[PDB]
Amino acid sequence: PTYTPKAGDTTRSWYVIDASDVVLGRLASAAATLLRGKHKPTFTPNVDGGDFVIVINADKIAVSGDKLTKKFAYRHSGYPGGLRKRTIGELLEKHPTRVVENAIIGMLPHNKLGRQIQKKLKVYAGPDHPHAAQQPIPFEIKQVAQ
Amino acid sequence: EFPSATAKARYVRVSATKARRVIDLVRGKSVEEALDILRWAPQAASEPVAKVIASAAANAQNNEGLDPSTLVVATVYADEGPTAKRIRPRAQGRAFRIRKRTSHITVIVESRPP
Amino acid sequence: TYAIVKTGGKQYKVAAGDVVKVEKLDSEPGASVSLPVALVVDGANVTSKADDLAKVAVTAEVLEHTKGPKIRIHKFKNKTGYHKRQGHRQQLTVLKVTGI
Amino acid sequence: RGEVSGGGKKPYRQKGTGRARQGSTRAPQFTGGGTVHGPKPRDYSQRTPKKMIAAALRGALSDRARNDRIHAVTELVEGQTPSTKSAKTFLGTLTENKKVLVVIGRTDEVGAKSVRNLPGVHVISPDQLNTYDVLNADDVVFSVEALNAYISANSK
Amino acid sequence: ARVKRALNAQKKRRTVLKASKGYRGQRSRLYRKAKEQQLHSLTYAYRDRRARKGEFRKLWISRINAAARANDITYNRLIQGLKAAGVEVDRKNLAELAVSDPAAFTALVDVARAALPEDVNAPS
Amino acid sequence: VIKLHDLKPAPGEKKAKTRVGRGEGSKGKTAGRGTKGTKARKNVPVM
Amino acid sequence: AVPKRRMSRANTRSRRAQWKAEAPGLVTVSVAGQQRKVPRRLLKAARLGLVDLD
RNA sequence: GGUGAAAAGUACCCCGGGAGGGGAGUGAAAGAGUACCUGAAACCGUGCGCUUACAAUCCGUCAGAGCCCUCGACGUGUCGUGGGGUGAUGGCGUGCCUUUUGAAGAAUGAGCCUGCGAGUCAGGGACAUGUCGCGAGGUUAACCCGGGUGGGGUAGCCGC
RNA sequence: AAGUCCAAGAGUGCGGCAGUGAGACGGCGGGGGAUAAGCUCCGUGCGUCGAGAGGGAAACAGCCCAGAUCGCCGGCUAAG
RNA sequence: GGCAGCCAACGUGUUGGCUGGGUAGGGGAGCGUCCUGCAUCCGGUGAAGCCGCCGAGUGAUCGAGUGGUGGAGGGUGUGG
């Protein structure tokens, strides 16, 4: 039978990704790939076999076009007329980590395992992060050419 | 297995659910503590339960020759018994069914070490 | 050393003494079957060329012929009255690989 | 549902009661109601052609004669007083099989009574000789008169 | 000949309830409601027996692609190269190698890259 | 010898009655009558 | 209104578990030499001999 | 409707006001206690194992960690051609019947279980096919004789 | 004239038994309508659903691919 | 790799080629029930029934395989 990850088989590493000047979609796609564990040959979709990702410089993320002012993050409170909307620029100004984190959880699966995966996304807006004690590995987003 | 005594009060005129409501207060407790709780429990279904438990303890002391102080209500449960069907007349001459429910209360007390 | 044997239309990674259930074979229990290989790996060397693989054959003893799990098909279409009950027990051969 | 007692009246209104439409408390679905397609007295006898009946009997007798299962006898016991012990002894000396069809004449009441009480021994008259009897019996014991009567009635 | 519908009737009921042992609520207790879930149960069993092959192939492809990226090659170019090299190892066993013996998978990656065309994008 | 337990009908002499209305496997539900209509509950006369 | 559907046994059980009796808190009292257990509210009555301790 | 073969239907102990029970006895059996053969399901408990209080579930199915038991092995506790319980998690997934162009349908019926509940029967009926018998013939109806199926019955019927 | 021809499981005739005789949508040709309708009425060796699962159209009988005899934890592809 | 329907070949049933979605419906072959002719076999050394266990069949279903309760009738073959 195909290999199934047993109890003591999921080893998680720590990757730190610098968000400065990186496209939001690229950063979020690669972060979601790492968080899911699509980069591990032991991948199993029913297991959280992914790696912790620490996004830094989340405030200096790069977007394109007018998305910084014409793309809205919406939230409904449930109360009638309770639709708040905040452009990506406003969201970067107020909660810089928000934009990037919302993108990454968007690209993650929407289920119990997805929300257990989210816990490994430690996004930070400053150039510094607190997890230096993890020896996070720098991770550049590279494309495997053909 | 600790020595044990049984006692089955059968066809008690109390709904099995109401007998259970008072059984849960005592299951697993010492016999003395169970009897005190049943004595001070408002639920009228407590008197049949207390009598079953006291009968179990009495059977333990006499028929089994066990020390009463070492007895605890090991397994006590109330099962449904035969239901009598009565008729309650209602408005527009419609007859509803009343259920006079009974219960079989079984108590099994064990002589556990101090 | 392990070989990815081809037997019964499927491929199985085996090593000396590994037991695999495969499709049925026309060999009595206790008989030996030589099965072609899709790839052998000896520790570090990997024989991938079909030319060098056609000369290596995995020998396996037939321990027995078994019947797989009982599949219970009940084809059903609603608002149709179409039920079709059916069963299956795939005939399989259990092989113990003697060596490569 | 028309033969079971009562059930003439429509049990309740057609509409308004919230219950299924019933036209009788004796309808088939009702407990205590009438059987829909239950049995009625039947005459299962079948008008089988005379030649078919006779050929079946001749075939059964032929099978017995081929297997040497047909015996003949001048008398069953001796005459006058029936004797089951004597008849059983004689049928034992004849045939060891269990089922025996004694084709005996109507007038041999002695032999009829004597052999009557043996367990596996049917007694039939030559004119009533039938397939079922011959086939059921392992052997067929004819009184000489019975055999002659059967042969005469058939060759005629 | 009045026949009671009891000996015969209970056989399928016991069968369906035995099969439904494990279902939640009525679907495990009532024969009628168990039968409704058993129809769907075997419809799903058939569907998922036939889709299990595809979903395991999907898992194998995911793992082979993971190992291919680790070995710095794309999955589709890896498959192209394996086909050109004549390596007839299926995706099941390729993923098995990816997980257990990454050196063997790196060997096969080298084989596939070697057998790839000098230019993959050239019309050829 | 031939016996009552050896007697059998001729090959193809007897045919199994068709039990109509017994489950969907055989002629089930409508019992070979199709959906609604006159012929679903009565036989239309020949004339 | 009327219940539109039979309540699942899980929901029935979960709501029915809430119909339970609270165990009375029993305090020791000395009456006639032997020790008895009575609610702290009836503690004064037991001391004054006003409680029928069977 | 059904205790048991027989009432042998619990002389006398204990808890309880009683009911009822526990002893002890009868009995082959009390897993037969006048609530009584067998004792199904629905339904209601209790005990144990797993599982669940961040979760959106036609309640399953397919993969499936973990945990709990079982059969072997080796005789280290780990592996197996294993088996069973539970099911974290992931994929897929729109009840049954009827009736419809089309229903998961917010169309109908069904609260649940058990039991019952629907193409049957008569007729030398009609047609068509199967199969036997006899065959240019084939059958006999009523009826008569047979404690039975069996033997007669040439009137008629269909062939011609 | 060939092809298909260990089959289309063809055509025709005569018999036993039917069910159907409420169709839907899509393409094309048209009528009625406003050259509206998911409208209505026709034609179409046109298709599909009806009575068709599987993949794709997100979900989505009728659209595209493709017609499920069963089992594989094999492979190549269709639409996408 | 298994099964089934048609067909062919030769045999004295093997192979091969095709074909096996399906509602109304048609045809074929079967499972199970209890009642019986006959024949056999099981049963107070424990029948049926019911509850399981271990399994079995291409289906309905099956266990003259087994354990618990049970207490008296059952199974099989072949026909009606």
UniProtKB/Swiss-Prot annotation, chain A:
* Lineage of origin: Bacteria, Bacillati, Actinomycetota, Actinomycetes, Mycobacteriales
Q: Which branch of life, at top level? A: Bacteria
Example GO biological process term?
A: negative regulation of translation
Mind telling me what this protein is named?
A: Large ribosomal subunit protein uL13
**Protein encoded by which gene:** rplM
Q: What does the subunit comment say?
A: Part of the 50S ribosomal subunit.
Question: Which GO CC terms are listed, alphabetically?
Answer: cytosolic large ribosomal subunit
User: What does the record give as the function of this protein?
Assistant: This protein is one of the early assembly proteins of the 50S ribosomal subunit, although it is not seen to bind rRNA by itself. It is important during the early stages of 50S assembly.
Q: Which UniProt keywords apply?
A: Ribonucleoprotein, Ribosomal protein
UniProtKB/Swiss-Prot annotation, chain C:
Q: Which GO terms describe its cellular component?
A: cytoplasm; ribonucleoprotein complex; ribosome
GO terms (molecular function) for this protein are:
rRNA binding; structural constituent of ribosome
Keyword line: Ribonucleoprotein, Ribosomal protein, RNA-binding, rRNA-binding
Q: List the disulfide bonds.
A: none
Q: Which Pfam families match?
A: Ribosomal_L21p (PF00829)
Query: Does the keyword section mention rRNA-binding?
Result: yes
Q: Does the keyword Ribonucleoprotein apply?
A: yes
Q: Say which domain of life the source belongs to.
A: Bacteria
> What is one GO biological process annotated to this record?
translation
| Primary role | This protein binds to 23S rRNA in the presence of protein L20.
NCBIfam families found in the cross-reference section: L21
Entry's family note: Belongs to the bacterial ribosomal protein bL21 family.
Question: What PANTHER family would the database entry show?
Answer: 50S RIBOSOMAL PROTEIN L21, LARGE RIBOSOMAL SUBUNIT PROTEIN BL21M
Subunit structure, per the record?
Part of the 50S ribosomal subunit. Contacts protein L20.
Q: Mind telling me what this protein is named?
A: Large ribosomal subunit protein bL21
Species of origin: Mycolicibacterium smegmatis (strain ATCC 700084 / mc(2)155)
Gene of this entry: rplU
Swiss-Prot record, chain D:
Ordered alphabetically, the record's keywords are:
Ribonucleoprotein, Ribosomal protein, RNA-binding, rRNA-binding
In this chain, the stretch annotated as Disordered covers 1-46
Q: Which GO terms describe its molecular function?
A: rRNA binding; structural constituent of ribosome
GO BP annotation list: translation
Signal peptide segment: none
Q: Which GO terms describe its cellular component?
A: ribonucleoprotein complex; ribosome
Coiled-coil spans in chain: none
Subunit details: Part of the 50S ribosomal subunit.
Q: Which family does it belong to?
A: Belongs to the universal ribosomal protein uL4 family.
In UniProt terms, what function does this protein have? Answer: One of the primary rRNA binding proteins, this protein initially binds near the 5'-end of the 23S rRNA. It is important during the early stages of 50S assembly. It makes multiple contacts with different domains of the 23S rRNA in the assembled 50S subunit and ribosome.
The protein here is known as: Large ribosomal subunit protein uL4
Identify the species of origin. Answer: Mycolicibacterium smegmatis (strain ATCC 700084 / mc(2)155) (Mycobacterium smegmatis)
Swiss-Prot record, chain G:
What are the GO MF terms of this UniProt record? structural constituent of ribosome
Question: From what superkingdom does this record's organism come?
Answer: Bacteria
> Residues annotated as region Disordered?
1-19
User: Where along the chain is composition biased (Basic residues)?
Assistant: 1-18
Q: Which GO terms describe its cellular component?
A: large ribosomal subunit
- Report keywords, A-Z: Ribonucleoprotein, Ribosomal protein
One short Pfam name that applies is Ribosomal_L32p
Which GO biological process categories is it annotated with?
A: translation
User: What is stated as this protein's family in its record?
Assistant: Belongs to the bacterial ribosomal protein bL32 family.
Q: What is this protein called?
A: Large ribosomal subunit protein bL32
State which gene encodes it: rpmF
